[PDB]
Ligand binder design. Sequence first.
Ligand SMILES: O=C(O)c1cccnc1C(=O)O
Ligand SMILES: O=C(O)c1cccnc1C(=O)O
Lengths: 289, 289
Amino acid sequence: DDRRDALLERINLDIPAAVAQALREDLGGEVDAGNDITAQLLPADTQAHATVITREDGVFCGKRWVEEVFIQLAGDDVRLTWHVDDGDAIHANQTVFELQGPARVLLTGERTALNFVQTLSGVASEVRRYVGLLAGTQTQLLDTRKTLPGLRTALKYAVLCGGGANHRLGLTDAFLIKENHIIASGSVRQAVEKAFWLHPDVPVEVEVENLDELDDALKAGADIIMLDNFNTDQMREAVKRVNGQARLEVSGNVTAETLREFAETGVDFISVGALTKHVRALDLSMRFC
Amino acid sequence: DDRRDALLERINLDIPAAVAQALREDLGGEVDAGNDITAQLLPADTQAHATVITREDGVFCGKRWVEEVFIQLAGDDVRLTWHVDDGDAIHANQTVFELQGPARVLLTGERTALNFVQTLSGVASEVRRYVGLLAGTQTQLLDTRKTLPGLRTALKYAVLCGGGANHRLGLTDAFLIKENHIIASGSVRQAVEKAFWLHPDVPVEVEVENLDELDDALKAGADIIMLDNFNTDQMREAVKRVNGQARLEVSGNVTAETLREFAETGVDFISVGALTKHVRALDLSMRFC
Ligand SMILES: O=C(O)c1cccnc1C(=O)O
Ligand SMILES: O=C(O)c1cccnc1C(=O)O
C-alpha cells in the first residue's frame, strides 16, 4: 500500500500552507513577526530560552509543524532541542523540547506553536487509548472523513502516531458503493464493474446491510466490504465465509467495551469517527526557565 | 467597541477561503465537484431532498458556512431551507435545514458542510452551557487565543452565538503584558507606561501576580488587569480597591462550580480557553427524506 507514502507527501506540502495561515490569523493577515505589538516592549536583541512541558500523560505529535512555525518567522535564528518524537509516550511534567532564540520571537511564536501540538497530540493520545484495547487481536483501528475543516491531513497523521491506520484521503482515492449506488447500476456486480472501469487502479468498497447482500458483494470482486449493523454473531459468521479478499470494515463508532467484542470476531477493520471529530487538547505550556 | 464589526468583517472574508480549504482536501486538490468518483456512478440529473437533523439539544451555528459549501460546488444549483438561525436553541430530533438539488452534489458537499456545523455548533453549544452558570452576576465570559489552527475567527464567531464575549483576535489588536514583558521594561509601571507611548490607542491589559502590582498598574492607567493566581478572598478585595476602570479579567479555566464563586466576587471578565481548544462535535445526520 502507498497511502502511507501518499499521506507522508501530502502533509509535507500541507504543513507550510496551514502554519502560514495560523500565523496569518494571529499577525493580522500578514506573516510579519514584527506585528506583535506587546512584544515590542522588549529590546530587539534580548536573547531568550524557554521550555515546553506537558502537564498530563499522553503521546506526542506535531514536531514538523513546530519547526515550521519558527522557520516562517525567523528561520536559522531559533534553535530547537527536542527530547521526544512524533509518536512517543509522554509523561506528566516531562519537558518535551526547548527553545533558543531572540526573546521577541519565542513570545510571538508561542501560541501558534502550542496550538498545533496540543491538538495533534490531543488526538494522538486519544487514538492510542483506543488502540490499547485491540491488543492480542488481529483487528485494526481506522479513521474517517469526519475531521476538523483544514486539519484533514494533519489529523490523519496524528491518527497514525496514535497507532491507527488511515482510510481513503477523500472522495478521490477510493470508491464507497452504497444502496443508492447499487440501485443506479442494476446490481452490485454491474456497480463494481463500472467502478473498476471508471478508475481501474483505485480500491472499491461496497456497503452491505445483511449476510445475503454480502455474498453478492464477495463474488462481485469488491476488495473491501463494510457491514452496517450486524451483531457479534453475524459479524463472526460473516468473516467465516470471506477469508481471502476478506477486507471487512465495521463502522464501530459505538462503545468502549463493544470495541472488544467486535475485534474479538476477527473483523479486519473498525473505523471510528469520534477519533477525529472531537478534540481534548493535551495540557501543555512554555515556561521561561 | 468595534470588535464585533472588525470580527464580522474578517469572517466575511475568511469563510470563502475556509470552505475552499476543506473542499480541496476532500476533492484532492481542487474545488471541482466532478472529482468525487463514486458520485459518477449516479444518474447526472436525479434531484433529491435531504434533511439535516441533530440528535441532541444545543445551539445552532454555521449557516453562512453551509451556504458557502454548496454555492461553491454548484453556484445557485441547490436550494437550502432554514428553520433555525445561528445561535438558536436546537432540540433533539429537530429538523435544522433542508436541501433541494442534484444528488451528485448533495452527497459530496454533505461531509464538508456537516463538519463545519458539527464543530461550530459543538463549540457554540458548550459556551451556552458556560454562560448559563453566570445568570445573576454581571460577569462576562470571554474566549482566549487558544483555538484550533485555521479556525480563529470561526470559533470567535461561534463564541458569540453561544452567549460569550470576544477577547482580542490576534497579537495585533491589544496589549497583554505578562511577566516576561514586564521584565525587559524594568517594572510594571514602566511597562504599561511604555506601551501607551508606542501604540496610544489599542487597549492595554497587564497581568499581575499580586496586590502590590495590582494598584501599581492601576495607577499607571491600564484598562483591564489580569489577576494571575488569586484565591477567592484576594480576588474579592482586588475588586474592591479597583472600583473605577475596574475591567478586571481573571483567566479561570478552573472548573464548572468554582467558576460561579469567582464571578460572584464581582470580577469583570472570565476568559476560558477550554472553549476553543477542545471540540465536542454536535451529533447531526443528513438523512434522505
Ligand atoms: O468516507 C470515508 O472515508 C468514511 C469511511 C468509513 C466510515 N465513514 C466515513 C465517513 O467519513 O463518514
Ligand atoms: O489574548 C490572549 O492571547 C488570551 C486572552 C486571555 C486569556 N488567555 C489568552 C491566551 O491565549 O493565553
